[PDB]
Design an enzyme around this catalytic site. Structure first.
Site, PDB file in Angstrom:
ATOM      1  N   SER A 203       0.844  -1.195   0.000  1.00 23.91           N
ATOM      2  CA  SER A 203       0.000   0.000   0.000  1.00 23.91           C
ATOM      3  C   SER A 203       0.891   1.261   0.000  1.00 23.91           C
ATOM      4  O   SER A 203       1.708   1.392  -0.922  1.00 23.91           O
ATOM      5  CB  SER A 203      -0.997  -0.039   1.149  1.00 23.91           C
ATOM      6  OG  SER A 203      -1.994   0.957   1.001  1.00 23.91           O
ATOM      7  N   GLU A 329      -8.973  -5.326  -4.012  1.00 24.45           N
ATOM      8  CA  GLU A 329      -8.273  -4.133  -3.537  1.00 24.45           C
ATOM      9  C   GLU A 329      -9.168  -3.048  -2.923  1.00 24.45           C
ATOM     10  O   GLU A 329      -8.756  -2.400  -1.958  1.00 24.45           O
ATOM     11  CB  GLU A 329      -7.452  -3.531  -4.687  1.00 24.45           C
ATOM     12  CG  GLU A 329      -6.225  -4.313  -5.106  1.00 24.45           C
ATOM     13  CD  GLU A 329      -5.094  -4.303  -4.108  1.00 24.45           C
ATOM     14  OE1 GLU A 329      -5.259  -3.678  -3.039  1.00 24.45           O
ATOM     15  OE2 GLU A 329      -4.071  -4.977  -4.357  1.00 24.45           O
ATOM     16  N   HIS A 442      -7.421  -5.583   0.710  1.00 25.80           N
ATOM     17  CA  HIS A 442      -6.186  -4.837   0.701  1.00 25.80           C
ATOM     18  C   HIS A 442      -5.379  -5.124   1.976  1.00 25.80           C
ATOM     19  O   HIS A 442      -5.856  -4.864   3.074  1.00 25.80           O
ATOM     20  CB  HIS A 442      -6.582  -3.357   0.611  1.00 25.80           C
ATOM     21  CG  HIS A 442      -5.445  -2.405   0.421  1.00 25.80           C
ATOM     22  ND1 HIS A 442      -4.816  -2.274  -0.804  1.00 25.80           N
ATOM     23  CD2 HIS A 442      -4.949  -1.480   1.269  1.00 25.80           C
ATOM     24  CE1 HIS A 442      -3.920  -1.318  -0.643  1.00 25.80           C
ATOM     25  NE2 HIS A 442      -3.983  -0.798   0.580  1.00 25.80           N
TER      26      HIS A 442
HETATM   27  N1  LIG Z   1     -12.276  10.793  13.005  1.00 21.21           N
HETATM   28  C1  LIG Z   1     -12.249  10.672  11.654  1.00 21.21           C
HETATM   29  C2  LIG Z   1     -12.519  11.796  10.859  1.00 21.21           C
HETATM   30  C3  LIG Z   1     -12.655  11.690   9.481  1.00 21.21           C
HETATM   31  C4  LIG Z   1     -12.376  10.472   8.869  1.00 21.21           C
HETATM   32  C5  LIG Z   1     -12.046   9.271   9.699  1.00 21.21           C
HETATM   33  C6  LIG Z   1     -11.982   9.422  11.081  1.00 21.21           C
HETATM   34  C7  LIG Z   1     -11.742   7.969   9.030  1.00 21.21           C
HETATM   35  C8  LIG Z   1     -11.383   6.752   9.812  1.00 21.21           C
HETATM   36  C9  LIG Z   1     -12.374   5.873  10.276  1.00 21.21           C
HETATM   37  C10 LIG Z   1     -12.020   4.699  10.949  1.00 21.21           C
HETATM   38  C11 LIG Z   1     -10.664   4.421  11.153  1.00 21.21           C
HETATM   39  C12 LIG Z   1      -9.662   5.274  10.668  1.00 21.21           C
HETATM   40  C13 LIG Z   1     -10.026   6.455  10.014  1.00 21.21           C
HETATM   41  N2  LIG Z   1     -11.709   7.891   7.610  1.00 21.21           N
HETATM   42  C14 LIG Z   1     -11.529   6.554   6.989  1.00 21.21           C
HETATM   43  C15 LIG Z   1     -10.107   6.257   6.539  1.00 21.21           C
HETATM   44  C16 LIG Z   1     -10.111   4.940   5.790  1.00 21.21           C
HETATM   45  C17 LIG Z   1      -8.679   4.604   5.416  1.00 21.21           C
HETATM   46  C18 LIG Z   1      -8.360   3.178   5.802  1.00 21.21           C
HETATM   47  C19 LIG Z   1      -6.895   2.890   5.583  1.00 21.21           C
HETATM   48  C20 LIG Z   1      -6.122   2.963   4.413  1.00 21.21           C
HETATM   49  N3  LIG Z   1      -4.844   2.594   4.691  1.00 21.21           N
HETATM   50  N4  LIG Z   1      -4.809   2.251   6.041  1.00 21.21           N
HETATM   51  N5  LIG Z   1      -6.097   2.467   6.538  1.00 21.21           N
HETATM   52  C21 LIG Z   1      -6.418   2.112   7.916  1.00 21.21           C
HETATM   53  C22 LIG Z   1      -5.441   1.111   8.451  1.00 21.21           C
HETATM   54  N6  LIG Z   1      -5.814  -0.274   8.386  1.00 21.21           N
HETATM   55  C23 LIG Z   1      -5.551  -1.081   7.342  1.00 21.21           C
HETATM   56  C24 LIG Z   1      -4.256  -1.237   6.621  1.00 21.21           C
HETATM   57  C25 LIG Z   1      -4.210  -2.190   5.461  1.00 21.21           C
HETATM   58  N7  LIG Z   1      -5.297  -2.943   5.139  1.00 21.21           N
HETATM   59  C26 LIG Z   1      -6.450  -2.939   5.849  1.00 21.21           C
HETATM   60  C27 LIG Z   1      -7.508  -3.781   5.515  1.00 21.21           C
HETATM   61  C28 LIG Z   1      -8.669  -3.733   6.285  1.00 21.21           C
HETATM   62  C29 LIG Z   1      -8.815  -2.924   7.402  1.00 21.21           C
HETATM   63  C30 LIG Z   1      -7.845  -2.004   7.733  1.00 21.21           C
HETATM   64  C31 LIG Z   1      -6.643  -2.005   6.994  1.00 21.21           C
HETATM   65  C32 LIG Z   1      -2.980  -2.339   4.583  1.00 21.21           C
HETATM   66  C33 LIG Z   1      -1.920  -1.311   4.950  1.00 21.21           C
HETATM   67  C34 LIG Z   1      -1.793  -1.219   6.464  1.00 21.21           C
HETATM   68  C35 LIG Z   1      -3.006  -0.467   7.006  1.00 21.21           C
HETATM   69  C36 LIG Z   1     -12.010   8.973   6.820  1.00 21.21           C
HETATM   70  C37 LIG Z   1     -12.018   8.867   5.421  1.00 21.21           C
HETATM   71  C38 LIG Z   1     -12.246   9.968   4.605  1.00 21.21           C
HETATM   72  N8  LIG Z   1     -12.070   9.795   3.276  1.00 21.21           N
HETATM   73  C39 LIG Z   1     -12.527  11.236   5.147  1.00 21.21           C
HETATM   74  C40 LIG Z   1     -12.555  11.423   6.534  1.00 21.21           C
HETATM   75  C41 LIG Z   1     -12.340  10.328   7.388  1.00 21.21           C
END
Ligand SMILES: Nc1ccc2c(c1)c(-c1ccccc1)[n+](CCCCCc1cnnn1CCNc1c3c(nc4ccccc14)CCCC3)c1cc(N)ccc21
Ligand SMILES: Nc1ccc2c(c1)c(-c1ccccc1)[n+](CCCCCc1cnnn1CCNc1c3c(nc4ccccc14)CCCC3)c1cc(N)ccc21
Ligand SMILES: *[C@@H]1O[C@H](CO)[C@@H](O)[C@H](O)[C@H]1NC(C)=O
Ligand SMILES: *[C@@H]1O[C@H](CO)[C@@H](O)[C@H](O)[C@H]1NC(C)=O
Ligand SMILES: *[C@@H]1O[C@H](CO)[C@@H](O)[C@H](O)[C@H]1NC(C)=O
Lengths: 538, 534
Positions: A203, A329, A442
């Protein structure tokens, strides 16, 4: 010193270390965890390029993982392994520039190829200390020297006021580069070969690996590269200097630091770390998915030009690259931001929810570009079928953000002299807690490459253990030779290099290697050739 | 005389000819005048009904072919010469032909009315492929075919004028339909069961009779083979027809509409034919100069508006396409193509071809076509590029207008049956690369393989018989399925939901779903937005 295990005492440029003897299924491994590679990037050093760690006195204890870089902790699904396995497993601190080394026990007699892991997490999260990045299996089974570093994420790693000296941007990439330089100087002390260093990441980690390929000062620090489900090119891995400036200025306002860059950055440096994390998501220009606020900036320094320009004009003659994707993905990205999606139901969506999802999934798309996406991904035989719309939504996000940037990268690298090997990982872990509709999400190939199924306590199947062993052999034969194929084995089918002519890639599943042609050739021609013309001419 | 060959129509007595069909005799009444010759002052004018005649009119031979451009591209070549006029060319051409069983049917028999194609610039009802004797003899059908004015004579319009209102070739067809209503009972035909059938411009003509209310009371069912009223070639706007008629007048040295049309009326027929091709706005293929005009009279609105808003309940339609609709069209206008070589083209020749094949397309629209039709696994493969070029032209002009028509008709209450004809005649002289070209299902529907002297295979004879049964079963009942054949596979109606169509080849009917569903979504939904927003 005197009563200690003589096999766990090593000296590096900065001084003496004491490691720990870890048990791996097949026998012991040496681990040197929490080695400082830089001066803590705290106080006045926040947003600043890393400085090398000054030498210490005495024996530094390197038996435990160190602090995880300051980041947003995922609390969406409490108690859920699916989300919590990616969460920080050590204290959060701005004092986080540490690296970990795993080597065979006793340490190798002859210089051993080195694998350097660069974790993902949208450049806002992640840690080298997570269980899925455990280097003990590769060290024990394959005799590898595995290194993983912590690098600054979020505002701390990538907040940029381009042109300033205080916040130049890309400092998280500089932290990675400093660990690469540390490896060059010190890895021989562990029995590592500094003349055979393979970077591997997934990633944002794969995008990071890609940016080390595209930045000349990094090129002299590694010989080969693995990009798993991520690329330097594509819609999320970088931002322009103008957009990074806009996001940093907005975040400063949100925390009460209103704008001269010197004055603004000085105020940001006075803010508690959690204040910056609390507002980092609030600077994204649209309602989007697969978009992160503070990511590498096209600064004209670390990145002399956009990764698209660099991949199209570069000479990659001297390079061997292993690239690939997972079967699904985009599936995970739908559970936070798209209405109609849930990990707790089958997520059968309506046409209206699909059109709305396409706007969130392709935020930079005009009305015409979004229609072109919808029309291409609709099954005109069943245009209202909820299962098809659900799967199409996952494919839009996966193709746009990962599969088609990967196909574009493989193609340009191959056309410009590189040895490219491409795969598709299609095996869904028997232990997966995300719904079946999410397929192979992913990041869920990582535990297989690192050899986690070799631990009997993790309850993977016998077939999953044999498959993890096959994968560890591909990755380490690639690290050793620039070819994933075993020379003393012709029975097992071969993995052909990816070429612009033949477009060959392999399927990575429980069955033997299967050679396929064209990685979403028609669909990625839409994303990589047509769609840029629609987001340009109109 | 033979009383079976003597008929009294509203205009007077006629004498037909007993013709030999493989299975026995048929009665044919050929060259029946249905209108006053549209000559002199009547040129460009709506047809007038034929005045009555004295004595017995001789209806034993085909009459003159409407004045048209004769194809001389490949002299002596059956491939092109089978479509060429087989009677003298004349402006005096408004005649129709009737084939009936011998002796004349006892009870009223369903009528099939054939409307030929030829891009509205050519064609004749007298061609060997349109021979009604097999359908009359084998199926007991009453088959009618008329000559209608083509080219400038049939479709040159100065919209709003009284002298050249346009669509007069469609009015000629309508007058033959009215003639059938008034006189077909005298031949044993049922005026209450009239099916229009046509191919290419003939199918577009059938479509325009569906969309024009005064025509609707003259038929009950329709067959559109490889052509539709909607689409990029079948019609022109009033502005574009005016532009083309003004340019043609200029080319023949003709200086107010009354004054201009009067000068055009003084020109020998060949002078008009010599310049008809020089009025097209671009270098194009599958585009014809003088075609039906959206006049606000015959066509109250564009066929696209009419098909989208019309009520088509109590109408049955059979629609379909051939396997390689566009292959022939590449042989004239596209560089790199020939009937005498395998036409393996380069990528450059493909991009250039797309511009000629989609002349209305902008640079972005042409790129969208190229990117959609390229096989990104073999983007430079000459065989793929050749086949893609043929598909662009066939899809744009025929397959996707057919899919759009079937869809709108079905959504708006019609009973639709759709097919794909995939059998290549063993006797075809066009190269193999051309596959099943535009118009090569016609000889099968008319039953030409039933003539042993034509050297078709036994399998082709059995297949022609199957096809004649589908067409006449459809004419009789509005359903092509055989009530006798209590064994399947049944031909299901085409619906917007299921999108079912059948394959017409030597093998039994095969039911397929979606007529180029993804590709026609590109042409019918996306591409209009690319020529609308940009
Ligand atoms: N308070 C607040 C305010 C606004 C927003 C948010 C929170 C969150 C949020 C919610 C829950 C957890 C974390 C963030 N996101 C969602 C973000 C989604 C991105 C997910 C992502 C992308 N890369 N890493 N991660 C999270 C880390 N975990 C993972 C990772 C990987 N795969 C995964 C597969 C499944 C579940 C989790 C995985 C591969 C790489 C390591 C990290 C937002 C997304 C957007 N677009 C806008 C605002 C917010
Ligand atoms: N002097 C001059 C000046 C400019 C142009 C031309 C000639 C010709 C021309 C060449 C040979 C014969 C007739 C016209 N064409 C090519 C037009 C060819 C149209 C093809 C067509 C479309 N409908 N009928 N035809 C010709 C009749 N023959 C056929 C017909 C059918 N199928 C066929 C299958 C294979 C071969 C011929 C077939 C089904 C229906 C009956 C007519 C032009 C085409 C364009 N687009 C522009 C200018 C000219
Ligand atoms: C799944 O759950 C979410 C959130 O509760 C909801 O928006 C969606 O409509 C649900 N879908 C189904 C198929 O029940
Ligand atoms: C493995 O399975 C046992 C049940 O036999 C269970 O108690 C244990 O928690 C499981 N552990 C994992 C990591 O799945
Ligand atoms: C086919 O013939 C024409 C001229 O007769 C020529 O322009 C074209 O290049 C030829 N194509 C091939 C494949 O030789």
């Amino acid at each position: 010193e005197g009563r200690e295990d003589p096999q766990l005492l090593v000296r590096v440029r900065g001084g003496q270390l004491r490691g720990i003897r870890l048990k791996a299924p097949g026998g012991p491994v040496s681990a040197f965890l929490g080695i400082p590679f830089a001066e803590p990037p705290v106080g006045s050093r926040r947003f600043m390029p890393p400085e090398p760690k000054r030498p210490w006195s005495g024996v530094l204890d390197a038996t435990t993982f160190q602090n995880v870089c300051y980041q947003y902790v995922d609390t969406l699904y409490p108690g859920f392994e699916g989300t919590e396995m990616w969460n920080p497993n050590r204290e959060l601190s701005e004092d986080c520039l540490y690296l970990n080394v795993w080597t065979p026990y006793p340490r190798p007699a002859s210089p051993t190829p080195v694998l350097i892991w660069i974790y993902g997490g949208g450049f806002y999260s992640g840690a080298a200390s997570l269980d899925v990045y455990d280097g003990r299996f590769l060290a024990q089974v394959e005799g590898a020297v595995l290194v993983s570093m912590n690098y600054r994420v979020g505002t701390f790693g990538f907040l940029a006021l381009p042109g300033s000296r205080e916040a130049p941007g890309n400092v998280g990439l500089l932290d990675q580069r400093l660990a690469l330089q540390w490896v060059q100087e010190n890895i021989a002390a562990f029995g590592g070969d500094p003349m055979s260093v393979t970077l591997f990441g997934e990633s944002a980690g794969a995008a990071s690996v890609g940016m080390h390929i595209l930045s000349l000062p990094s090129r002299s620090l590694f010989h080969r590269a693995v990009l798993q489900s991520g690329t330097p090119n594509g819609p999320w891995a970088t931002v322009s200097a103008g957009e990074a400036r806009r996001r940093a200025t907005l975040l400063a306002r949100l925390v009460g630091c209103p704008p001269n860059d010197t004055e603004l950055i000085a105020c940001l440096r006075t803010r508690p770390a959690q204040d910056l994390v609390d507002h980092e998501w609030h600077v994204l220009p649209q309602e989007s998915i697969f978009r992160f606020s503070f990511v590498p900036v096209v600064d004209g320094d670390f990145l002399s030009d956009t990764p698209e320009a660099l991949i199209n004009t570069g000479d990659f003659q001297d390079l061997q690259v292993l690239v690939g994707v997972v079967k699904d993905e985009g599936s995970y990205f739908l559970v936070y931001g798209v209405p109609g999606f849930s990990k707790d139901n089958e997520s059968l969506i309506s046409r209206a929810q699909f059109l709305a999802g396409v706007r969130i999934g392709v935020p930079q798309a005009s009305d015409l570009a979004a229609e072109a996406v919808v029309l291409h991904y609709t099954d005109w035989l069943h245009p209202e079928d909820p299962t098809h719309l659900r799967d199409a939504m996952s494919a839009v996000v996966g193709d746009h953000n990962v599969v088609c940037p990967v196909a574009q990268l493989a193609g340009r690298l191959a056309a410009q002299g590189a040895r490219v090997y491409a795969y598709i990982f299609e095996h869904r872990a028997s232990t997966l807690t995300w719904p079946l509709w999410m397929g192979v999400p992913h990041g869920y190939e990582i535990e297989f490459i690192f050899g986690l199924p070799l631990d009997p306590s993790l309850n993977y199947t016998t077939e999953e253990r044999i498959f993890a062993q096959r994968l560890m052999k591909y990755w380490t034969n690639f690290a050793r030779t620039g070819d994933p194929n075993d020379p003393r084995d012709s029975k097992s089918p071969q993995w052909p290099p990816y070429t612009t002519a033949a477009q060959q890639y392999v399927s990575l599943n429980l069955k033997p290697l299967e050679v396929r042609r064209g990685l979403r050739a028609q669909t990625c021609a839409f994303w990589n050739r047509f769609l840029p013309k629609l987001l340009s001419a109109t």
